[PDB]
């Protein structure tokens, strides 16, 4: 047994995987076996969901997070997001679960049986963390792989049945995307938009054409960058800018994944385009707006003139103006006037919500949708008691949007912590004081006094 | 539900998603067996 104790490796058991830093074979093992764990989870979880799936009940009433992902890709669903065929979910789950055996096989092999280091075995697969060119080369391979994956999304959307479009004319349906947005002004226009209210940066993407065209851009960008990095080595400024070590690269990737996690949190909380409410339930904004809609409808049916109804505060009880004048729902949902959803947009006019359309044109399906979303607002207890914190036990419900937002905020945060930990440690270790201060050469002792 | 032919495997399918967690737990059994050296 090489290096697997603290005396030889310098690392205690609780930092055991740090023993793997310069053992590329066992480390490859660790990575492959882990990828095995991820795929295993996707598969087993998919099959569990399907086994538990009651097809006539809304997905979001059944604690599902993966099946909604498959459905968003156009698999297994028809008009209004209704489940027409459960077999594609089964396929996805099974194929993941079977693939995980393979990844697990290679992982266990490399981890305990295969060559502990790869450098003497092969100069292609072997590597030195401090070898900047090899690092950018492997980086390049993975960039090309990711680019390919993005083009697989594009392919699904354009040539293999399309994607579920909640915005599809006449109602939500699976739609083939024939004209993806290629205009770089729109695509990178998203990247240049404010993350604040009514703008919402990339989280604001509200049509599949933009999503798909964006993935065409990301695909080509990633492939081109991969080729770039296989054909180049880091410039001087980059050499002097970074720390060049395994733990450092790890720290960079941790910061990136933290950032992505926070982005995903906001995406699943606000966006109802790539996270269709048919599958994930209404957003908080969506459900609040839906409440306002619901009672506007009820009270108008009773004879209320909702445009002229003055609330207790002086503001319209049902309808008021946003700070730039748009007609918006009133009450507290005034904060959510940036909300957009297919059930609400037909009532929208040039100046915002249109009083004539509200009086005359509200369809029963809109009332149904507003009621459903209002009564499936993403509020619930940890033990999955649906509704406000004061609601009695009765409804078994916590929105998938809440599970995914909470989970990914926790993970993104701890990944930021990980980033700080490893970036700092990598800096200290590269500089040579990660284990503490040299008593005979304490830097502060050679510095002048502050006062 | 799973396709009818697979129905007999419902209980196994019920337990599968939990397996990855057991791997973390396994790391400690292993470490206990080598005395956390």
């Amino acid at each position: 047994a090489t290096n697997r104790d603290q005396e030889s490796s310098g690392f205690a058991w609780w930092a055991g995987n740090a023993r793997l830093i310069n053992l590329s074979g066992k480390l490859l093992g660790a990575h492959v076996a882990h990828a095995g764990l991820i795929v295993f989870w996707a598969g087993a979880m998919t099959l569990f969901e399907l086994a538990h799936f009651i097809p006539e009940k809304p997905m979001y009433e059944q604690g599902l997070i993966l099946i909604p992902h498959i459905a968003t890709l156009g698999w297994g669903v028809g008009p209004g997001g209704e489940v027409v065929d459960t077999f594609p979910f089964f396929v996805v789950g099974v194929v993941h679960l079977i693939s995980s055996a393979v990844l697990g096989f290679g992982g266990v092999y490399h981890a305990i049986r295969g060559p502990e280091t790869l450098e003497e075995y092969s100069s292609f697969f072997g590597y030195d963390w401090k070898d900047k060119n090899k690092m950018t080369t492997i980086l390049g391979f993975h960039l090309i792989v990711l680019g390919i994956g993005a083009l697989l999304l594009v392919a699904k959307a354009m040539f293999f049945g399309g994607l579920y479009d909640t915005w599809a004319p006449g109602g939500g349906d699976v739609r083939v995307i024939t004209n993806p947005t290629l205009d770089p002004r729109v695509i990178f226009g998203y990247l240049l938009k404010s993350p604040f209210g009514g703008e919402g940066w990339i989280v604001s993407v509200n049509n599949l054409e933009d999503v798909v065209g964006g993935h065409i851009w990301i695909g080509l960008i990633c492939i081109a960058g991969g080729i770039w990095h296989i054909l180049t080595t880091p410039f001087g400024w980059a050499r002097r800018a970074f720390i060049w070590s395994g733990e450092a690269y790890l720290s960079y990737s941790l910061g990136a994944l933290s950032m992505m996690g926070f982005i995903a949190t906001c995406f699943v909380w606000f966006n109802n385009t790539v996270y269709p409410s048919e599958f994930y339930g209404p957003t908080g904004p969506e459900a609040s707006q839906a409440q306002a809609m619901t009672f506007l409808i009820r009270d108008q049916k009773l004879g209320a003139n909702v445009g002229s109804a003055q609330g207790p505060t002086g503001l319209g009880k049902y309808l008021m103006r946003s700070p730039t004048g748009e007609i918006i729902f009133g009450g507290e949902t005034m904060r959510f006037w940036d909300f957009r959803g297919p059930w609400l947009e037909p009532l929208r006019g040039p100046n915002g919500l249109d009083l004539n359309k509200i009086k005359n044109d509200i369809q029963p399906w809109q009332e149904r949708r507003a009621a459903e979303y209002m009564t499936h607002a993403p509020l619930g207890s940890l033990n999955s008691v649906g509704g406000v914190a004061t609601e009695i036990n009765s409804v078994n419900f916590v929105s998938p949007r809440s599970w995914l937002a909470t989970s990914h905020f926790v993970l993104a945060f701890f990944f930021l912590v990980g980033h700080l930990w490893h970036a700092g440690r990598a800096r200290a270790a590269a500089a040579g004081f990660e284990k503490g201060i040299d008593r005979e050469s304490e830097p502060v002792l050679s510095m002048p006094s502050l006062d | 539900k799973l396709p009818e032919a697979y129905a007999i495997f419902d209980p196994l399918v019920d337990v599968l998603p939990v397996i990855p967690v057991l791997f973390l737990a396994l790391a400690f059994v292993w470490q206990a067996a080598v005395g956390f050296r």
């Binding site: 305990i112 | 209980p11 196994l12 019920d14 337990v15 397996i19």
Partner: peptide, 29 residues
């Protein structure tokens, strides 16, 4: 309920079983 507990026990035991087998046969633990 009994089938579930039985699958859990077989899968749950499999790991400690691997460790035990290797410990018995002076394996590369």
């Amino acid at each position: 309920v009994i089938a579930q507990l039985t699958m859990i026990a077989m899968i749950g035991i499999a790991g400690p079983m691997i460790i035990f087998l290797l410990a018995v046969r002076r394996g590369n633990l």
